[PDB]
Enzyme design. Sequence first.
Site, PDB file in Angstrom:
ATOM      1  N   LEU A 188       0.843  -1.187   0.000  1.00 10.13           N
ATOM      2  CA  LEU A 188       0.000   0.000   0.000  1.00 10.13           C
ATOM      3  C   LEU A 188       0.880   1.240   0.000  1.00 10.13           C
ATOM      4  O   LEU A 188       1.813   1.343   0.803  1.00 10.13           O
ATOM      5  CB  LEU A 188      -0.930   0.015   1.215  1.00 10.13           C
ATOM      6  CG  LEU A 188      -1.953  -1.114   1.330  1.00 10.13           C
ATOM      7  CD1 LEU A 188      -2.879  -0.867   2.506  1.00 10.13           C
ATOM      8  CD2 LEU A 188      -2.746  -1.247   0.043  1.00 10.13           C
ATOM      9  N   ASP A 189       0.583   2.179  -0.894  1.00 14.72           N
ATOM     10  CA  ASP A 189       1.322   3.430  -0.951  1.00 14.72           C
ATOM     11  C   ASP A 189       0.816   4.364   0.149  1.00 14.72           C
ATOM     12  O   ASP A 189       0.060   3.961   1.036  1.00 14.72           O
ATOM     13  CB  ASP A 189       1.220   4.055  -2.341  1.00 14.72           C
ATOM     14  CG  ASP A 189      -0.203   4.137  -2.843  1.00 14.72           C
ATOM     15  OD1 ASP A 189      -1.062   3.406  -2.312  1.00 14.72           O
ATOM     16  OD2 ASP A 189      -0.464   4.934  -3.768  1.00 14.72           O
ATOM     17  N   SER A 190       1.107   5.664   0.068  1.00 16.92           N
ATOM     18  CA  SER A 190       0.723   6.567   1.191  1.00 16.92           C
ATOM     19  C   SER A 190      -0.798   6.729   1.361  1.00 16.92           C
ATOM     20  O   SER A 190      -1.297   6.380   2.446  1.00 16.92           O
ATOM     21  CB  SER A 190       1.401   7.904   1.080  1.00 16.92           C
ATOM     22  OG  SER A 190       0.808   8.692   0.064  1.00 16.92           O
TER      23      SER A 190
END
Lengths: 238, 60, 242, 185, 122, 186, 80
Positions: free
Chosen positions: G36-38
Amino acid sequence: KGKFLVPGAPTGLTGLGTHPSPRSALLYLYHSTLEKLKQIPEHSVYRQSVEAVTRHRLALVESVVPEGYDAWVERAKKLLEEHADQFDPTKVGPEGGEEVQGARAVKVERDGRVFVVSRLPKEEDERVLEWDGEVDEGPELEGSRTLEEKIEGGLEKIFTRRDVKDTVGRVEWEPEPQLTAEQVAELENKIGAGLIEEVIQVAEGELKLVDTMVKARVWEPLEEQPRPGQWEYFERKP
Amino acid sequence: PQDMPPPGGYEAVQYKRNLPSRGLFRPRPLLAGAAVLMLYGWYKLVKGIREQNELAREKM
Amino acid sequence: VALPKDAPNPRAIPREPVGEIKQALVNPADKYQSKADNLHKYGAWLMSCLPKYIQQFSVWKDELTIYICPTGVIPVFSFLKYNTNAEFTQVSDITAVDFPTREMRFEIVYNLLSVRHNARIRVKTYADEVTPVPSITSLYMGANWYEREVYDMFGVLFVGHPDLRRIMTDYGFEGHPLRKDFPLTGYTEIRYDEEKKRIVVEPLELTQAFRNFEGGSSAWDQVGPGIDRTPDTFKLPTPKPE
Amino acid sequence: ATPAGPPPKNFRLPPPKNWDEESESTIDKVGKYFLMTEMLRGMYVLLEQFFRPPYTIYYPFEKGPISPRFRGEHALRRYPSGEERCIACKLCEAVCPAQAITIEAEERADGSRRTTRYDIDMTKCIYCGFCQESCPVDAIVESPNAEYATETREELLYNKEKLLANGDKWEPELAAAIRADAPYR
Amino acid sequence: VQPTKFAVTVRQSRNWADAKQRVIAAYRAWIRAAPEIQTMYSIPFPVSHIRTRIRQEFERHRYVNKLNVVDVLLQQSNADFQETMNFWRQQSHVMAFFKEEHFRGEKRLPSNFITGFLEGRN
Amino acid sequence: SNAVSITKKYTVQSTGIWERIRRALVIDPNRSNGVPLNPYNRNPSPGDNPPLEYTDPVTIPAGDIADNPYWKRDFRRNYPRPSVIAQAQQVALLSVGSAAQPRVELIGEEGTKALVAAEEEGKEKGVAKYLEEKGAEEAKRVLALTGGLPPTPSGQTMVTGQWDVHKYGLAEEQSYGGSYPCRSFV
Amino acid sequence: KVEVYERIKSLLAGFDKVNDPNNITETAHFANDLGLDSLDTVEVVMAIEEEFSIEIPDKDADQIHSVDKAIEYILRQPDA
Ligand SMILES: *P(=O)(O)OCC(C)(C)[C@H](O)C(=O)NCCC(=O)NCCSC(=O)CCCCCCCCCCCCC
Ligand code: SF4
Ligand code: SF4
């Protein structure tokens, strides 16, 4: 009757009331200004300008003396020495203490000169004052309480607060004599900068200004050069 | 020519406040007037009710 | 009608004849040279008192302009508010001008009023699309809406401003209309749609296109370069002959 | 607040007066309060107006005054011979503050400089008289007419036919208004 | 806060670490408010559809590497957020933000060269 | 008294028994009713003002046919250019004075180069650095330009003949007297 | 507690941005393990906040970067 202006009496400018002790307020402000300007270099024109205006106005405020000033000063000076613990800010605080029902007074030092700031209970109708104006901090904590909430309830104030009638070891501060209404008008005619109350307002602002100027160091080289063409409008070449 | 003032100049016109006092609204004659009506009315009311009271006597 | 006895017909009074009217030729700039020296001296003293931020000053007729770098906005206006010889305690106006040929395209203009001295002063700084300016709301309450207007029309940020939002444009309006690159009729327009039963934004479409007669500007310059009126007390000395 | 220099003479107000020091008797003070004297006086003013003549005029049977300068419905005018006054200079199209005028022109069949299109968008026009001031031949004028409200907006898009018909109908007013005000123009 | 409900004083970011917190803080407030936004403007879309639009708006500016530009975008986001959570916007304003509700569609540009050419520049 | 006579106020008057009734009942008989007189008010209508009477006036300097060259009255093209002073110019004005008052002799040669020295110095060091090298004496010199005290802003009215503040003072006639909280300033 | 984890799977498994389901653990991280990115992480914590009906402060939300960190965080909060 009209010999002395009434503190709080409207001046004519809305929200600007007559000053309680206007001559000493100006002396306090002017002297506070000169002392605060001592942290600016001598080559700053800003410092040179404020000095010239203030020391010139200061000279004029000193030129008007309340009647009987010399008589008051000797006793007032004599009163400070014998009761210094009553007026030193390091002991009673800058406000003179937590007792508002009573009179407070603090000696303070500015520009080599000493001033006493006094505070008095506000004149209020006896029909409306409760316990002679003593501050209501709610009721005490009764019941089964921990030590922590007792200290949070100011229990230590029991050992340090003083009853308002209790004046055994202290003395009554006597106010400076006031300039007459005739003296106020002729003094502000000398300053030529509006009513004494407006002149005090300008002194308060000028005192506030020094701190901004010192923090900004406005006397040092230009912070940012104007890049070429920054201020070029549509002017025709002559 | 052009629209110009008269050679003498126009006469002065009223602009200062003019709300003159009048006697129809002074309170002292109004208070005296009100008192007389009340006094006269109570004189007539005493005479009226006393008569009305005597009529009830005759009717009863 | 019943006329007033002492009110005669004011048209019926004959007027004295008027003949050869003579009016002298007046240059309206001449009357300001009396104070030209004093305005330069005041600007010079301000520059001496605040040399770190005041880049230049200019005097045109009776208007003194002060040119400053954005960082000095708070110190300079504090001085103009509180100094005993500068009691400019009112902000008459704050506005902006756009100059796309400049790197700092936005010129911020403040007009101040000193009731005590019966005087006015102009302060100019500059800003960019991404370079903010200090808000002067802490010194002047009246400045609050003027800075919102500058932000609305020009997109200039004022750091320290509480509640910097649009004041003139519609909610959700895109663009800053007083930018020179913003077109006159903008980009969009509204109407009521009878399917959606509400108002809808749509791309702008004009039944008659705007006709710009800017091309009719004179092919010859019509004003010229003007006249130099710098006082002698602010012009440099000249070497004497021999 | 006050101008620089010494305080204006008597600028400072005298101290407030206590209730005790008021120079007005109790009976007068109590009487005005309970009798509402100033309210009665204001009511008496209304009765005075009740018996004065009203200012109302009975429109449309009577009309309010207008001047020879009055700016109303636009018209195109002729010469006494009947030739159009308009020569397609486009001065009115250029000066128009609202861009309400659209003009097209060429040489007429006889070679005369005349318009082919002369439209005024009456829903763009701000009725300022600038066209009438700019016209060098008195071709475009504003008539005194103001009573031409329409059912549809399209009826307010005047073309050359509508404007020349307006000038034909209103010409005696147009000449009279020009006659009275031309010395001042 | 003090001036009006969702008023945020204009401040610069001190550093890139400071800016990132504000950007994530701004996104968090936006997608949190999405349920309220739906019922407050009676939007005919699910909160999922609204929250996707929020991310795309933040993704148009994901590649910005300039601190001053971020401060500008952050100020715009706060201004839009305040005028939404306060009922200052009208349903027409918020509905115009959803590009699907234009009668010419959302694919308002030609798919490729030949569709735009056959229709006449789109 | 404050009121002007009803007999001088350009309004329809009452007559006969009705004027005596009016003077007996109204609050102030000198008060008009605001109805204008038809023989005097807008009579004749401006549309029947004889056009030949009005004369368009021409002032003879501007409107002469003999002695008015346009360039002598072309005050638009004689507009003042803004007088601009930068930090470099003020340092030069402090170093070597002005044309109205020089600081040194500056006589011909060795003064032309001396004068340009004051220019390049002004460009290199601004006002602040210049003052800092020279010290407090220069600061006193800047205030010496304005006579010791700092200057005051110029006023914006010339009624007394000089630019100054307007000397607001209470009017000798107070319109409300003292019965209301509003004072007349002249 | 264990009741929180069974609710945690109810939303992460339903999340469409997970690299592969059944990759969830008692201590899995959104970035390293789950990919998961930011902002996808910002959304996951917001979905958990909805499940326990407790608002999460932005500083507290920054602290939450793993499935365990959320399980620990929700237990401390009185509301659930
Ligand atoms: P993650 O690593 O995925 O991303 C983190 C960030 C975004 C910080 C990037 O990695 C990044 O480095 N970005 C560079 C700087 C940046 O983030 N730019 C600032 C952008 S703020 C922004 O885009 C605000 C837009 C708000 C729009 C909200 C929705 C529109 C309003 C209407 C709502 C619906 C109708 C009511
Ligand atoms: S109406 Fe008059 S100004 Fe307009 S084009 Fe015709 S002639 Fe020219
Ligand atoms: S009246 Fe004014 S706005 Fe209307 S057409 Fe003539 S110039 Fe244009």
